[PDB]
Ligand binder design. Structure first.
Ligand code: CL
Lengths: 18, 83
């Protein structure tokens, strides 16, 4: 999961929580 | 621990949780899984979540949102918590 380029909903959601 | 208010509690329990108190990490986890499992996110731009005509729209008070708006989402989440 790359927070510079999430491609998936759960990676966006993980990035929300950093 | 934090205590979800009534609608968020219903949403969390719909994912399989049974308890009334959670850590924040658990709330975020089950909320994210609710959206994933229920396929509420847009297929092409997957940070977009459709809330209309769903429990989640009832408790956030919006028809949609972008996960990229971090402060906005946490603001909606905390409005549905007693911390
Ligand atoms: Cl409520």
């Amino acid at each position: 999961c790359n927070c510079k380029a999430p491609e998936t909903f759960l990676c966006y959601w993980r990035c929300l929580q950093h | 621990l934090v205590r979800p208010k009534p609608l968020l509690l219903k949403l969390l329990k719909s994912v399989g949780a049974q308890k009334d108190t959670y850590t924040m990490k658990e709330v975020l986890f089950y909320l994210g899984q609710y959206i994933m499992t229920k396929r509420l996110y847009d297929e092409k731009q997957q940070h977009i979540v459709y809330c209309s005509n769903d429990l989640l729209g009832d408790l956030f008070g919006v028809p949609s949102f972008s996960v990229k708006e971090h402060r906005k989402i946490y603001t909606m989440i905390y409005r549905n918590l007693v911390v």
